[PDB]
Design a protein around this ligand. Structure first.
Ligand SMILES: [Mg+2]
Ligand SMILES: [Mg+2]
Ligand SMILES: [Mg+2]
Ligand SMILES: [Mg+2]
Ligand SMILES: [Mg+2]
Ligand SMILES: [Mg+2]
Ligand SMILES: [Mg+2]
Ligand SMILES: [Mg+2]
Ligand SMILES: [Mg+2]
Ligand SMILES: [Mg+2]
Ligand SMILES: [Mg+2]
Ligand SMILES: [Mg+2]
Ligand SMILES: [Mg+2]
Ligand SMILES: [Mg+2]
Ligand SMILES: [Mg+2]
Ligand SMILES: [Mg+2]
Ligand SMILES: [Mg+2]
Ligand SMILES: [Zn+2]
Lengths: 141, 36, 140, 140, 184
RNA sequence: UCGAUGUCGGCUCGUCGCAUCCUGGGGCUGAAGAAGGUCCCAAGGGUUGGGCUGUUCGCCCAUUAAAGCGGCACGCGAGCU
RNA sequence: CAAGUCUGGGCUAAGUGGUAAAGGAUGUGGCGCCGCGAAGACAGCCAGGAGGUUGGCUUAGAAGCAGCCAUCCUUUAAAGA
């Protein structure tokens, strides 16, 4: 799928989502990027679906950069079970995304293909997106 | 025909807006749409 | 391969009221469930437990079974006519007759009668198959 | 290319042509015959040599036609200079052929007519494009 | 290029930035002042420009100064700048990542491949009078797999960089083949 | 609500919703016609009799224009069973 | 239903106000910088609307028009593998 090979701990506390991405806000790799506008937990099955959606779109073409990674475990109790008796079992992993985060990047692809590409990938994401270019996104120094 | 996301299919498709509703007129029928 | 993914795309799952004992709830809960397979006509039921969700999956855990058996019963009849029919082994049904006595081979299918039997038993078969790939694929 | 409302443009074989395989009947759907374009046709192909003869047709609905012969397609004439038979399943930078500088002016003595330009160099740079079509290299 | 600049008295940061003026500070190895330079021209210029080409800064003193931007902090949510750092100059030798053009066609573009110009704006140590432009590199030799890098390039006389030279400047990698799927 | 709010199914009596099974209107159709498919508008009124099982539900017989799905304390025991 | 059908400036035409999301839309009103406007198409209206070549390959066929690949050049007023 797209989980981590090993982890010191298998289940971990839920947490929260205070706006601002902290990091990952500029392009820095490809030419066009997809930036998250709402905060959320993106399941690896979505990251995946979106990715495949792009390669599928411009089959045999440019390069894709997945800027996020699902390292946070998702717990879910069984069905018809009551509360308590311990924490649920891990059902998958998710990457936490905050507003401003550049989730994906593309390169070696026409500006038409780039747009269309990311527009399809955002239709697989639980949130709202924005497509970007490159310019001040040059924190080289 | 009747959907929530109505768009222009072919080049000849036109987006009319009559009686409060968003429609799509076009040469060939199969392309007709009424948002709803 | 070995696969059979019966997607819950052709199943009709019902949930009637429990039957038998129970209590103030056997009359109230839709425990009993019934999964139906339409392209076959097979139906599996279940009231073993006291929960619909533990019964529709446990009732599916069977339809998977019976099917793999009746979906395989075919692989037994569908492959038993692809092979052919000739195989009685009785006296009077030989494709080729081998003889070390007078020493010769009698291809009964062609009409040819080689004289090198001992030679054939070494793999030399280009020629009987040369004629065999004719008599056989010559009627179709 | 000629006139319309009853025409067809093909690139006939060379040497023999009467049956139906290549295009023998295709010209008959739009109006044609078997005794008008077979022997009373190869008068030109017997002259053009062999290989391909981009000669076409024009129907009138009475067994008449304007058999305006043409010069081998720049697609074929290039396989002679380089050598290859096809060209390439896919052109680009790799191709099973080669064509030096004046190699393209070898055809300069061939294609001079209907290209558009009478000269050899203002009409050869056109075939340098068929060297980016089939693939065929351009030694230099 | 050129651009107007004004002096900031140090009053209502977040406000002077809403009114339309973009905040900032100009410093160097001597003095350092606080100023405000509107988005209008700033934007327009900064994008064409960047942090490669120098700019003028005529204040109410006229005092036009040569500078290159060192720091430009965005706004995270919804791209926008909130600040900019200006490094004044002279004949004083300093650094700056110099633009990169890559005239050529890698052999990595015939059977599948695209150029990943890794460090497409290389940092080099050098003075003002020594400020080039499109510092091109050759790509006509980049095979599909294996790819160029380091400071193995055309550094015009005076180009005393600061790489390794190993710092992978660029590379060519394969496409996105439909052929995938898996599991197990 | 435990100083009590009788619990499945049936019968009787209905009434309401529409996400419509008929019947009326209608647009697409890979609509020749006849017959269908799919979506749109529309409950005004209709929406069968049996075999099996306590059954609800189902399967089956014989029909039908159709044999719609749900709510009402999975409607209705100071109405019956 | 006690006290302004008070004053000045905007917006909305949905009874929005007087519930809802992805996502749709030449709804409106207002700021933006780009096209490019007597080489006066912005829309109609008049003529064009080319040649190697049907590009090669693939293939029953692939002739701009399944698809893989390449996307250079010739002639003018214009014209794309
Ligand atoms: Mg950093
Ligand atoms: Mg008991
Ligand atoms: Mg209950
Ligand atoms: Mg009680
Ligand atoms: Mg009481
Ligand atoms: Mg009722
Ligand atoms: Mg009809
Ligand atoms: Mg309705
Ligand atoms: Mg219940
Ligand atoms: Mg009841
Ligand atoms: Mg009673
Ligand atoms: Mg009562
Ligand atoms: Mg009053
Ligand atoms: Mg008033
Ligand atoms: Mg609304
Ligand atoms: Mg909305
Ligand atoms: Mg919206
Ligand atoms: Zn249309």
């Amino acid at each position: 799928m797209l989980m981590p090979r090993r982890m010191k701990y298998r289940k971990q506390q839920r947490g929260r989502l205070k706006g601002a991405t902290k990091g990952g806000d500029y392009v820095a790799f490809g030419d066009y990027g997809l930036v998250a506008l709402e905060p959320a937990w993106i399941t690896a099955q979505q990251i995946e679906a979106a990715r495949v959606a792009m390669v599928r779109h411009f089959r045999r073409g440019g390069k894709i950069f997945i800027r996020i990674f699902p390292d946070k475990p998702y717990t879910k109790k069984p069905l018809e079970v009551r509360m308590g008796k311990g924490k649920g079992n891990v059902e998958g992993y998710v990457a936490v995304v905050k507003p401003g985060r550049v989730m994906f990047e593309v390169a070696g692809v026409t500006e038409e293909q780039a747009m269309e590409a990311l527009r399809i990938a955002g239709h697989k994401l639980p949130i709202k997106t924005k497509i970007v270019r490159r310019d001040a996104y040059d924190e080289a120094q | 025909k009747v959907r929530a996301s109505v768009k222009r299919i072919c080049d000849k498709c036109k987006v009319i807006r009559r009686h409060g509703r968003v429609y799509v007129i076009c040469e060939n029928p199969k392309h007709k749409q009424r948002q709803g | 391969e070995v696969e059979v993914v019966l997607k819950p795309e052709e199943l009709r799952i019902d949930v009637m009221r429990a039957s038998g004992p129970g209590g103030q709830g056997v009359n109230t809960t839709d425990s009993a469930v019934r999964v139906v397979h339409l392209p076959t006509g097979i139906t599996v039921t279940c009231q073993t437990t006291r929960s619909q969700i533990k019964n529709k999956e446990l009732a599916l855990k069977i339809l998977k079974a019976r099917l793999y058996e009746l979906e395989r019963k075919k692989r037994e009849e569908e492959l038993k006519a692809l092979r052919g029919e000739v195989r009685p082994i009785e006296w009077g049904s030989q494709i080729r007759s081998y003889v070390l006595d007078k020493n010769y081979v009698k291809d009964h299918r062609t009409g040819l009668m080689r004289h090198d039997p001992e030679n054939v038993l070494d793999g030399d078969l280009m020629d009987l198959i040369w004629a065999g790939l004719e008599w056989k694929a010559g009627r179709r | 290319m000629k006139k319309v409302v009853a025409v067809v443009k093909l690139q006939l074989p060379a040497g023999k042509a009467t049956p139906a395989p290549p295009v023998g009947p295709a010209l008959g759907q739009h109006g044609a015959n078997i005794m008008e374009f077979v022997k009373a046709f190869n008068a030109a192909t017997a002259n053009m040599g062999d290989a391909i003869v981009p000669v076409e047709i024009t129907i009138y609905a009475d067994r008449s036609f304007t058999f305006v012969t043409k010069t081998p397609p720049a697609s074929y004439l290039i396989r002679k200079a380089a050598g290859l038979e096809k060209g390439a399943h896919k052109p680009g930078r790799e191709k099973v052929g080669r064509i030096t500088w004046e190699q393209v002016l070898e055809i300069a003595k061939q294609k001079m007519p209907d290209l558009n330009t009478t000269d050899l160099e203002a009409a050869a740079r056109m075939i340098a494009g068929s060297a980016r079509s089939m693939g065929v290299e351009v030694v230099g | 290029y050129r651009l107007k600049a004004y002096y900031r008295e140090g009053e209502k940061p977040s406000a002077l930035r809403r009114a339309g003026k973009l905040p900032g500070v100009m410093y160097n190895r001597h003095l350092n002042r606080k100023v405000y330079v509107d988005l209008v021209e700033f934007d327009k210029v900064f994008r064409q420009a960047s942090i490669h080409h120098v700019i003028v800064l005529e204040l109410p003193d006229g005092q036009s100064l040569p500078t290159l931007v060192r720091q430009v902090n965005l706004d995270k949510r919804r791209r926008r700048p909130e600040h900019v750092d200006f490094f004044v100059l002279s004949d004083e030798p300093v650094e700056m990542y110099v633009p990169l053009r890559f005239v050529g066609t890698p052999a990595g573009v015939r059977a599948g491949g695209v150029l990943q110009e890794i460090h497409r704006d290389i940092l080099v140590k050098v003075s003002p009078r020594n400020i080039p432009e499109f510092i091109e590199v050759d790509v006509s030799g980049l095979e599909i797999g294996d790819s160029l890098h380091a400071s193995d390039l055309k550094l015009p006389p005076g180009v005393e960089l600061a790489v390794s030279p190993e710092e992978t400047i660029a590379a060519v990698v394969p496409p996105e083949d439909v052929e995938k799927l898996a599991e197990e």
